Symmetry: C3
Subunit: 106 residues, 3 copies
């Protein structure tokens, strides 16, 4: 998928998680987020398209999705132990990782 579609998937599933009623719904949404994070890692964002493909900025962009995938994995750990409310709160905390990348490159 392209970068914009992966971002919608990320945004839509944050809300799905917030409103989820059970562990399986949070787990499923978090799995879609991880898939979208890894897929976004393949793109060149518009504001970096003039940079070289392995410029420090493009490396920082790609590693941002590794950081997001690891944070998603911690939240998924909580959902798999059945700690649904703690997983929902960890998911909402993802926004600081979202924001950090946005402030630099979006």
């Amino acid at each position: 998928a392209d970068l914009e579609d992966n971002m919608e998937t990320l945004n839509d599933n944050l809300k799905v998680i917030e409103k989820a009623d059970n562990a399986a719904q949070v787990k499923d949404a978090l799995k879609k987020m991880r898939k979208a994070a890894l897929d976004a890692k393949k793109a060149t964002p518009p504001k970096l398209e003039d940079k070289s493909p392995a410029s420090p900025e493009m490396i920082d962009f790609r590693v941002g999705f590794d950081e997001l995938a690891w944070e998603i994995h911690d939240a998924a750990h909580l959902a798999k132990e059945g700690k649904v409310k703690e997983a929902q709160a960890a998911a909402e905390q993802l926004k600081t990782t979202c924001n950090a990348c946005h402030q630099k490159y979006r």
Copy 2:
């Protein structure tokens, strides 16, 4: 190890997992797969050797091993909870990630 040896390790351990008799055998095989996936990420495949080192294709190649490592990690989660048959079925499902990369670059 070189790319071809990492692929054999991946292929051989898929079969080891299929025939495994207990959780520890699946766990051990999945750990060897993850190690091989990360090691393969360092290579340039023959059909991409004319591309630039951070070309979209080489990025897509390397991220494919992140996707495989994450899918392996989900299967390993199942083996560590003792759900041996579910882990064996998740391992067989890895083939769709194997195939997707192969269809593009092998």
Copy 3:
């Protein structure tokens, strides 16, 4: 943070883990290690600054931090199951991954 500060964070938390008295202290230290490993992945080490940004050596450097992050994650798994002594021993085993990168690039 810069590469040198991320390495200190890695070194300091290995010792924190060795002397830890409970699971939460090991968990917290391992989380700081993962964060530092991913952050170090954004740097160019001095001995590679003449290489091209996606040279095989820079790829090998960056993938070394993926390998370290995955090994840290296995240790964290043990700390979250309450197997504190096994997690402490896994952490000390990280040194062979530290050493392998150092022998090549530091």
